[PDB]
Every structure is written in C-alpha cells, then in structure tokens.
Amino acid sequence: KRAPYWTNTEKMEKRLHAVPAANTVKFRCPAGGNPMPTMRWLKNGKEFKQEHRIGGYKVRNQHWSLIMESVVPSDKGNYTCVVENEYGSINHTYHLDVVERSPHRPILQAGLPANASTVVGGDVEFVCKVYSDAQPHIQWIKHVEKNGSKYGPDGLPYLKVLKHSGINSSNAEVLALFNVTEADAGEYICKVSNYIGQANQSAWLTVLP
Amino acid sequence: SYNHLQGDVRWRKLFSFTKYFLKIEKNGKVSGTKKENCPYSILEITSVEIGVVAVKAINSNYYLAMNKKGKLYGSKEFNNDCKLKERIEENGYNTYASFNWQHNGRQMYVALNGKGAPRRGQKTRRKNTSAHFLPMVVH
C-alpha cells in the first residue's frame, strides 16, 4: 500500500506553459500509488469546479490529465493538481498563460515624434513608439530635392529614407540627428508598417540660426 | 500584458505548437528544446522588410535559415536563406516561411516535429501544426 508518487517525472519539469487564445490545453500529473490515488485540481488555490469556466473541462483519470477546450483569457492562472490516497498526498502546479494575438496594422503612440528646435550644429532625436503584434518595419521618410526641383515629373514629392528597420539598426524607433545643419530643418515622417497595414505620423525640426 | 506588441528589434523565444522552444546551438544545428533556460532559445527577431524578418539565436550568433534544398540551419553570416516571412495564422500562432526557396509551388515552413526535430522544408505545410510558433517576450 504505497502512498502516491509520480510516474514520468520528466513530463513534469515544465512549470510554465503558454498558448494563444481559442486553443486547447491539456495538463497532466502521471501518478501511481497503492491504493489508486485520486486526483484533484485547484485553480489559484481555490477548488476547480466545472461551473468555473464556460463549458467546464474534462479529466482523463486514466491519464491523470486536465483538459480545457478553447481557453479564454479568464483561464489565466495557476493550476494545481492534488494526487492522494489515504496514506498520503503529493501535488504539482502549472502556470497557464493565455495570449491574445492582435493581427492589425500598427498603431503609434500619439504625440510622437514630437516637434524639436536646435541651434545649428546641435543634436536632436525623433522618437516614435510602436504597437504591433506582427513584426513592424519602421522607416523615417523625409522630403528632399533632386536637381533643384522639389517635385518629380509625376507631381509627387521626392522622398528620402533616412533610416529603416534592419540588421544595421538596433533601434529604428529613435532617429538621432547629429551636428544639425540648417538644411536639416523640415518635416520628419515616421512610417511603421507590417504585412497587414501601416500608419504614419510626423514632427518638425527647426534649426535656429 | 501588452509589451509583446512593442519594439523594433525584439528579443523573443519561439514556442512551437509541439511545446518546444526553437533553439540554435553553437554547433550551428537547429532544434527545439523543452527547457525554459537553454540560452539558445533567446532569439533576436528583426525586420528586414515589410512582413519579412531575420531570426537570430542571440547567443550562438546564428541566424535561423533555410537552404534552397529545404533544411533548417544557422549561418553566422546573414544571407537570403535567413529571410523569413512572418505571418499570424488564424489560431494565434505564427508561421515562418522561407522568403526565397519554395517547392512544387507551395511554400516551405520552419518547423519542429513531435520531438524537437527540424522538419524538412519540402515536407512542411502552412496549416500543419508542426509549423506554428508562439513568440514569447524575453526581458
């Protein structure tokens, strides 16, 4: 008559588990012991009842598992299993984190970039905070000139990309301008875009003579 | 909970649907660990172009990459076998497809099997759970 003990301790080394919403989670605590130890589940200390999460859950006694279908964010928390027989009891807890993916074009923090002023020769930067689940591609565009003409034959402006995201830039969200020359004055556009869409906001640089 | 939607260069971990953390070890080889500490799962995801990224094993200085043949591998130097096409599937998971190499018309995806084993590009499928990954914040 052995008090409860674990079967495959290997499959119980993971304390943290994450999944995007609407997916399925299966928690397990393979146990043995004589007589047959019972299994109980707690959610954040409190007893875990079927009436707790919409659609309850299923327990595979034969597998010592807890199964939650199409987890929702409210399913976030600690899940403690309690195995026991009259001669003793052991437990283990997993921390389930439910993630919610935001598949939209980026959205930028308002007010950034912010307008700036600087004595010719001074320094300045233009920040631009970004929110995007899908990897965002940042690019600082500015209006420039080509052969003394501010515009092209199609009537659209000539644009220059002062800095974009990539392997050479550890931080495209910031754009430092060192030794500001007078010609640096003007509008600095910040355009962030991901495979879904893009967004863009600007600021101004004024160089005091 | 939002800081996962933040930043240009992003330090993340890629947890496969098969509950593995994609890692790239010093020997160059790509595989998925189940540990939570293996510092070869700390990837450095960066955008090379709209919708296209470069995943880098931050410690073993290796870029996750795919050769025209269809096999995962990590080169120290960044090349076009490193450009991955990142996309969010309808199940909250991400898929990383080769930006260059294709086959039989379909696309080849970065993927781990039942036991952290690097799948063969040609044999992978976008919708097949083998190629799904939950990017995870590291800070």
Curated annotation (Swiss-Prot), chain A:
Changing residue 140 to C: In PS; severe; also in a lung squamous cell carcinoma sample; somatic mutation. Glycans are attached at residues 78, 91, 115, 147. Changing residue 139 to P: In CS and JWS. It is found in: Cell membrane; Golgi apparatus; Cytoplasmic vesicle. Its main location: membrane. Monomer. Homodimer after ligand binding. Interacts predominantly with FGF1 and FGF2, but can also interact with FGF3, FGF4, FGF6, FGF7, FGF8, FGF9, FGF10, FGF17, FGF18 and FGF22 (in vitro). Ligand specificity is determined by tissue-specific expression of isoforms, and differences in the third Ig-like domain are crucial for ligand specificity. Isoform 1 has high affinity for FGF1 and FGF2, but low affinity for FGF7. Isoform 3 has high affinity for FGF1 and FGF7, and has much higher affinity for FGF7 than isoform 1 (in vitro). Tyrosine-protein kinase that acts as a cell-surface receptor for fibroblast growth factors and plays an essential role in the regulation of cell proliferation, differentiation, migration and apoptosis, and in the regulation of embryonic development. Required for normal embryonic patterning, trophoblast function, limb bud development, lung morphogenesis, osteogenesis and skin development. Plays an essential role in the regulation of osteoblast differentiation, proliferation and apoptosis, and is required for normal skeleton development. This is Fibroblast growth factor receptor 2.
Swiss-Prot record, chain B:
One of its GO terms (biological process) is actin cytoskeleton organization. Glycans are attached at residue 128. Keywords: Disease variant, Ectodermal dysplasia, Glycoprotein, Growth factor, Lacrimo-auriculo-dento-digital syndrome, Secreted, Signal. The keyword Secreted applies. It is found in: Secreted. Belongs to the heparin-binding growth factors family. This is Fibroblast growth factor 10. It comes from Homo sapiens.
